[PDB]
């Protein structure tokens, strides 16, 4: 009569454990490299009813795993092409005055130097055009010369974003919530599990999310401790706001041989007019989008507070300005026009003067760098604005007329908007159950 | 009547059903512990090896563990070990058909090593009696 124990194998059990995931890409490149195992186009998602699960945003190891993973890919892809050691020679530069707009006066610097040719016993005089943000007076030298010299982006291996699927190994499962009111952390009554996550674009930005996955129904303000101003506030929109970015210059590329089987590509001679790179966003759409953001944001703060917006709080060029990698050419753009408004309780575009820096310093690891060769002709961009990464200003008195400014810029936050749903769990098949059991003794 | 509580509820599907109804879904659980990486440089080379070895090692630990208990080769097996009633003073109907398994393991997770500490001793004993009967 007294109940005994029974051994149960495979019964569903979950334990919070995190390990190394795996990559899968859809049918050379920098992300996939045709190395990740292809994922079958039947992402069988299964809904678990009568269950609730806990999700810890900003503590998920998936965010950390992806951050370290792509950096390894970046280093891997930069090793096999020419280094730029011999480009640190003295630069005798000059201004550009051939059909120059007043807004970009003194930006490009026509330069000449005595960089070496392929033969070790001969020199050559080569002239190239460099942006103001790539040279420094000593007459000129490259900005990165006193820092470790960097390689040149392998011209062929484009950095165009490609969706990447993350799948856990056997014996582990990935759970994703589905409630449309999901906060940063809390139980979700619509738990589901899937072996592989949907396409995640690793596209880069610092202020405005580009090509992100939009929210389901309403604008969501996902944030940990909110009364603390020291942590960023992540906002995800619900209807995309189209963004146009273009480079008007008709640039041309010159190939200069540096050594045996090692070539360097320079800029110029430019053709046509000299016009500043600019981006465009609809005025009507942005005002509506911002109005919706404050409406939801006002539910977490005072209703009578006068919400204001302003540009960044200054600092290094890397974080103070919007960044993206459209068309393989980097743009640093001043977004003071998208935050110049005030909201009180109760014409088709914006001109954003952008900037181009040809020498790129990647993640704040200071020992690395890279060169991006120019691309012939004009470059056009069409992307979607899906959210913002704002920061809360301090010194507020009595919590009235609160304001936010764009900032942050850490790469982890960009993926957090895509990995907040997904968490990794471990399966505990073994188990013991009490019942009235009598083993058949031999 | 094609809809019966069975495998097609999905891998881990029984986690929302009662413990009694989850017994028939224990076969869909053991199958998804090895496969999934059958089809196939440092990055993703060592990672694939590390993931594959860990999955293989993890499954072995349970297969070994069931081997010492003598339940190996039977998905649902039991021994003659009684258990201290103080752990859970509940009836069979009060355990199987009225509560989910997920929160169950949490309550008795404290005595997982203790309850394991009785299974192997009896299995070795059961072998000893068979040896005595054998001789």
């Amino acid at each position, epitope marked *: 009569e007294n109940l005994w124990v029974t051994v149960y194998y495979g019964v569903p059990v979950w334990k919070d454990a995190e390990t190394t995931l795996f990559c899968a890409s859809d049918a050379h490149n920098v992300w996939a490299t045709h190395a990740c195992v292809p994922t079958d186009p039947n992402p*069988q*998602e*299964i*809904h678990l*009813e009568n269950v609730t699960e806990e999700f810890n945003m900003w503590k998920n190891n998936m965010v950390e795993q992806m951050h370290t993973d792509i950096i390894s890919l970046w280093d891997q892809s930069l090793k096999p092409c020419v280094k730029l050691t011999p480009l640190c020679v003295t630069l005798q530069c000059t201004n550009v005055t051939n059909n120059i707009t007043d807004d970009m006066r003194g930006e490009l610097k026509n330069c000449s130097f005595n960089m070496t040719t392929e033969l070790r016993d001969k020199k050559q005089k080569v002239y190239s055009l460099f942006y103001r943000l790539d040279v420094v007076q000593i007459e000129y030298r490259l900005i990165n010369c006193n820092t470790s010299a960097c390689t040149q982006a392998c011209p062929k291996v484009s950095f165009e974003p490609i969706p990447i699927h993350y799948c856990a190994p056997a014996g582990f499962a990935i759970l994703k919530c*589905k409630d449309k009111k999901f906060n940063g952390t809390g139980p979700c009554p619509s738990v*589901s599990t899937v072996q592989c996550t949907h396409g995640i674009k690793p596209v880069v930005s610092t202020q405005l999310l580009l090509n992100g996955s939009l929210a*389901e129904e309403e604008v969501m303000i996902r944030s940990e401790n909110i009364t603390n101003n020291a942590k960023n506030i992540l906002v995800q929109f619900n209807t995309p706001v189209q963004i146009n970015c273009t480079r008007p210059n008709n640039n041309t590329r010159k190939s200069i041989r540096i050594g045996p089987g090692q070539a360097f590509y320079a800029t110029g001679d430019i053709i046509g007019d000299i016009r500043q790179a600019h981006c465009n966003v609809s005025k009507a759409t942005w005002n509506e989008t911002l109005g919706k953001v404050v409406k939801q944001l006002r539910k977490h703060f005072g209703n009578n507070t006068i919400i204001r917006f302003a540009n960044s709080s200054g600092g290094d060029l890397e974080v103070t300005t919007h960044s993206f990698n459209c068309g393989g050419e980097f743009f640093y753009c001043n977004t003071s026009g998208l935050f110049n408004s005030t909201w009180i309780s109760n014409n088709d575009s914006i001109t954003l003067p952008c900037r181009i820096k040809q020498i790129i310093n990647m993640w704040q690891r200071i020992g690395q760098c890279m060169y991006a060769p120019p691309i012939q002709g004009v470059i056009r961009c069409v992307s979607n604005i899906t959210g913002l990464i704002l920061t809360r200003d301090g010194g507020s008195t009595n919590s009235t007329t609160e304001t936010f400014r764009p900032g942050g810029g850490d790469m982890r936050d960009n993926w957090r908007s895509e990995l907040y749903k997904y968490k990794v769990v471990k399966i505990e098949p073994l188990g013991v159950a009490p019942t009235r059991c009598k083993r058949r003794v031999v | *009547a*094609v*809809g*019966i*509580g*069975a495998v*097609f*509820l*999905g*891998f881990l*599907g029984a986690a929302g059903s009662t413990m009694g*109804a989850a017994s028939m879904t224990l076969t869909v659980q053991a199958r998804n512990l090895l496969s999934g990486i059958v089809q196939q440089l440092t990055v993703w080379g060592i990672k694939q090896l590390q993931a594959r070895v860990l999955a293989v090692e993890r499954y072995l630990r349970d297969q070994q563990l069931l081997g010492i208990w003598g339940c190996s080769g039977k998905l649902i097996c039991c021994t003659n070990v009684p258990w201290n009633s103080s752990w859970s003073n509940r009836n069979l109907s009060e355990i199987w058909d009225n509560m989910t398994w997920l929160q169950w393991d949490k309550e008795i997770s404290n005595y997982t090593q203790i309850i394991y500490g009785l299974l192997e001793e009896s299995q070795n004993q059961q072998e000893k009696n068979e040896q005595d009967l054998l001789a």
Partner: antibody
Framework: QVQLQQPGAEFVKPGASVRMSCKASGYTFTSYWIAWVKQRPGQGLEWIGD????????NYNGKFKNRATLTVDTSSNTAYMQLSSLTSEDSAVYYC???????????????WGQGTLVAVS | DVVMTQTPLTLSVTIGQPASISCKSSQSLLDSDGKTYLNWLLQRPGQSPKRLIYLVSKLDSGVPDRFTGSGSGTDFTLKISRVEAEDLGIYYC?????????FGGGTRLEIK
């Protein structure tokens, strides 16, 4: 009210494909079974298939040798069916009917919709 | 599989008379749980199919007094006391225990 919205009618061409949708509203889509039914005017009702809007498990009739691919969406509460590439004699109306729960299964055929006229020509 | 045949292919009836329709199963449909999930649905001429009897002992909502489902094991029947325009149609006996969930062969009620 438990309703299964269906498209009115689709006119397709030989060698083409169709996206036979079936909207779910007024209930929980993650539990009830979903099955399709044929209503040829000159012939009796025929069993086409069944899709489980949960685990994604799919079952197909023996006579069909897996000629169709069944897909569901738990986010938008919709169900989809591929033919795939049917022919002329199979031009009739298909009904997306809601089944019962995988445990009880007694209320099968509880509710229907209006169907969609598939006329490949 | 278990086939579902019905004797009446054509049933000539005038308004105000009792109608009889029956169905057969090759194998007994008594499920282990102790129930018969057979359904008697009257498909309207061009409208969506509508069930009339489920769990033949039990009856559906909007109960019509004329319809009285009965039968177990191999024999299934549905007796109608009076005929109405709604009664004129096609009845299908649907088994609900084995695979596939085959419907009935169809019995037509028409006035000639």
């Amino acid at each position: 009210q438990v309703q299964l919205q269906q498209p009115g009618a689709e006119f397709v061409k030989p060698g083409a494909s169709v996206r036979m949708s079936c909207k779910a509203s007024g209930y929980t889509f993650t539990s009830y079974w979903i099955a399709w039914v044929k209503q040829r005017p000159g012939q009796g009702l025929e069993w086409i298939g069944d899709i489980y809007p949960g685990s994604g498990y799919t079952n197909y009739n023996g006579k069909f040798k897996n000629r169709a691919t069944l897909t569901v969406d738990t986010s938008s509460n919709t169900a989809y069916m591929q033919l795939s590439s049917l022919t002329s004699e199979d031009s009739a109306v298909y009904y997306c009917t809601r089944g019962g729960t995988t445990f009880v299964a007694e209320p099968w055929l509880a509710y229907w919709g209006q169907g969609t006229l598939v006329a490949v020509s | 599989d278990v086939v579902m045949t019905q004797t009446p292919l054509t049933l000539s009836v005038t308004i105000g008379q009792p109608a009889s329709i029956s169905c057969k199963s090759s194998q007994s449909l008594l499920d282990s749980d102790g129930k018969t999930y057979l359904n008697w649905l009257l498909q309207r001429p061009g409208q969506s199919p509508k069930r009339l009897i489920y769990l033949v002992s039990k009856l559906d909502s909007g109960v019509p007094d004329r319809f009285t489902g009965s039968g177990s094991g191999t024999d299934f029947t549905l007796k109608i006391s009076r005929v109405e325009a709604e009664d004129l149609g096609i009845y299908y006996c649907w088994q609900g225990t084995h695979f596939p969930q085959t419907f009935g062969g169809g019995t037509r009620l028409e006035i000639k």
